[PDB]
């Protein structure tokens, strides 16, 4: 009841994404905007505007719910049948509906850090979800599988200003946690921006015109095409560059590439224009020193917030008309690669036989600090994990540039090496409590094995890929490892939650003072200068 409590002027509903909202907006259902209110003081400059809201009443937007006199008496506009005969006096307050560009505090639990609560500009919208620009999902750790989020409405000129001047989304793009951004380009826009900025992506004039008009900050000057004859064609790098403000310089070297960049890797940006380099997560993600970080330092939070919208609107248009998919086909390695994969796993199973032989004939090297059986399990584990990594590498190299899984991994928008490995080549060794599957039956893992069986298949090595399908033994062993993950998530969440609370209570009163010192509520010096700098 005292350190926290339930509050008025709050709301909650399911969240959705919107490619056509600015980074710092929140789409608010009309019904919510008519229930919430803000008490605006009546002055000469708004009395006409506010009388219009009063006439519209509590059920029509833009409208109003109460009229507050200087004495404090509220006039309930639901029950006032002569609302047209109300005259507002200066100094009165009108509790009007929530309206476009009102600042509100937006929040997703668990509120782990300060950008779990940021101020957005209202946009009133039909349908019943709160709408988010996709690039704010990361600091909220939000997605749209049922997540809900909370909205709080400030009730005065002073608290509105704290939201818009301290908590607003654009002020939060770079976090003090790691001196780097906490928002970047994600999902469709990140997948699409790689595809669009490939060296052989060309765009005809009629489409170029639509793409240019989709950038709100575009200056109206069509740039000359990279190819003039025999046909005007613009490159993807040219149109992405429309979204980058001028005066932006960025250089990155990937794998010692030259200025001639044969692989189209690295990155070179001059006056907001892409010279070479596929634009991917290394450039437009949230990493330190990338594009978003640079525009923030060079142009400030307003321009940097528009950057997300500009990039999104060009790329999402291009991707809408290019298309992108994934299917079962993208998990399929060709018959030659499967035979390498199957051979390499077969030879790894043989090495495990040799290791079993040595350990059972007292011919195995003991590692310092380890029993024989620990050393045995360690050698078996290294062999089986190297088998899976080796089979994944063969599968990885066999996948074409056009492979849809490979395209998402390459953009950095979803997936990684291990996902290719387990889908296409080999799921691999299942672990519980850091070890292979234990003998939960007497000297065996399942009644389908003989006793004293230390082979890969007996103690949880899943040889098949998800494409091929798991055997009944593999299925159960995989479910054992999987259960442990669900248990960990359910248990250790309270372990770290208590830790964070104790950290907060230990440190909550510690502030930087006007003499530069860092002190608690007793005025004790904790640091003579914050961060020693």
């Amino acid at each position: 009841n005292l350190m926290g409590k339930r509050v008025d002027f709050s709301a909650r509903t399911v969240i959705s994404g919107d490619p056509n909202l600015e980074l710092d907006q929140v789409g608010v259902p009309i019904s919510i905007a008519k229930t919430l209110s803000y008490p605006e003081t009546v002055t000469q400059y708004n009395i006409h505007r506010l009388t219009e809201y009063v006439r519209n009443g509590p059920n029509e937007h833009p409208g109003a719910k109460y009229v507050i006199r200087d004495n404090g008496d509220r006039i309930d506009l639901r029950y006032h049948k002569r609302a047209g005969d109300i005259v507002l006096q200066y100094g009165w307050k009108v509790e009007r509906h929530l309206m476009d560009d009102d600042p509100v505090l937006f929040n997703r639990q668990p509120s782990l850090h300060k950008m779990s609560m940021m101020a957005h500009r209202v946009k009133v919208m039909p349908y019943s979800t709160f709408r988010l620009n996709l690039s704010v999902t990361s600091p909220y750790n939000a997605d749209f599988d049922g997540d809900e989020m909370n909205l709080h409405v400030p009730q005065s000129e002073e608290t509105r200003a704290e939201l818009s001047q301290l908590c607003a989304v654009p002020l939060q793009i770079v976090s003090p946690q790691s001196n780097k951004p906490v928002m970047g380009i994600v999902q469709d826009t990140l997948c699409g921006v790689r595809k669009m900025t490939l060296r052989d992506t060309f765009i005809e004039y009629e489409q170029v015109m639509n793409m240019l008009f989709w950038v709100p900050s575009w200056d109206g000057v069509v740039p000359q095409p990279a190819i003039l004859k025999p046909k005007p064609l613009w490159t993807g790098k040219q149109l992405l560059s429309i979204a980058i403000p001028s005066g932006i310089h960025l250089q990155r070297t990937d794998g010692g590439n030259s200025l001639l960049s044969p692989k189209d890797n690295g990155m070179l940006i001059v006056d907001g224009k892409v010279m070479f380099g596929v634009v991917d997560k290394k450039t437009v993600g949230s990493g330190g020193g990338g594009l978003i970080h640079t525009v923030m330092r060079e142009k400030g939070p307003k321009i940097c917030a528009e950057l997300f919208g500009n990039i999104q609107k060009v790329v999402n248009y291009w991707l809408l008309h290019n298309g992108f998919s994934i299917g079962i086909g993208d998990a399929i390695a060709d018959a030659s690669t499967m035979k390498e994969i199957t051979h390499a796993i077969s030879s790894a199973k043989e090495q495990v036989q040799e290791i079993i032989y040595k350990a059972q004939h007292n011919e195995l090297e003991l590692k310092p600090g380890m029993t024989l059986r620990e050393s045995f399990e360690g050698e078996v584990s290294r062999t089986l994990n190297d088998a899976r990594d080796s089979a994944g590498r063969s599968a990885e190299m066999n996948l074409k540039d056009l492979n849809n899984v490979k395209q998402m991994v390459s953009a950095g928008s979803k997936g990684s090496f291990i996902n290719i490995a387990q889908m296409s080549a080999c799921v691999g060794q299942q672990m519980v409590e850091g070890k292979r599957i234990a003998f939960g039956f007497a000297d065996r893992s399942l009644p389908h094995f003989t006793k004293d069986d230390f082979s890969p298949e007996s103690k949880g090595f899943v040889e098949n890929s998800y494409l091929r399908g798991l055997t009944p033994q593999e299925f159960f062993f995989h479910a054992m490892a999987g259960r442990e993950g669900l248990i960990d998530t359910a248990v250790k969440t309270a372990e770290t939650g208590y830790i964070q609370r104790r950290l907060v209570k230990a440190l909550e009163d510690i502030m930087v003072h006007y003499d530069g010192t860092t002190r608690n509520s007793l005025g004790d010096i904790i640091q003579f200068l914050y961060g020693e700098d």
Partner: protein, 137 residues
């Protein structure tokens, strides 16, 4: 009548609990009872089982999909999923509108949901026959 218990009292099927299971040797499918001569790069790899020279099977599984319960039996191809996804569906399947009974019109329940036009799934499992999933989808 000659049904399930007729098989149990004629020595071709018996019941085992966790304690007796400790002392038996189970083949996973009837085909595993006898050794073989494959190299079909599409189908899944069966364990080699080369630790014992000759196996002495006492029992054989009737079908290995019977390790699943009611909810997980609704998943098509659960052997091709990361195991937690099968747990997640086992939860969500109980949250899916269908036809909970055929007499919903005469029951006055606190809350009830009936899908207008239920369809039976194009991809089903053998175990769904006993759950009536195609009849009350």
């Amino acid at each position: 009548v000659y049904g399930w218990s007729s098989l149990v009292t004629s020595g071709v099927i018996e019941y085992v609990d966790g304690e007796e299971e400790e002392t038996i040797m189970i083949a996973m499918t009837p085909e595993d009872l006898q050794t073989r001569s494959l190299n079909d790069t599409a189908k899944r790899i069966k364990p080699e089982m080369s630790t014992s020279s000759h196996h002495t099977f006492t029992h054989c599984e009737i079908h290995p999909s019977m390790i699943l319960g009611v909810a997980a039996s609704i998943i098509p191809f659960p052997d091709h999923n990361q195991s937690p996804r099968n747990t997640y569906q086992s939860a969500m399947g109980k949250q899916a509108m269908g036809v909970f009974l055929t007499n919903y019109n005469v029951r006055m329940d606190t809350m009830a949901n009936i899908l207008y036009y239920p369809q039976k799934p194009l991809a089903k499992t053998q175990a769904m026959e006993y759950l009536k999933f195609r009849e009350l989808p």
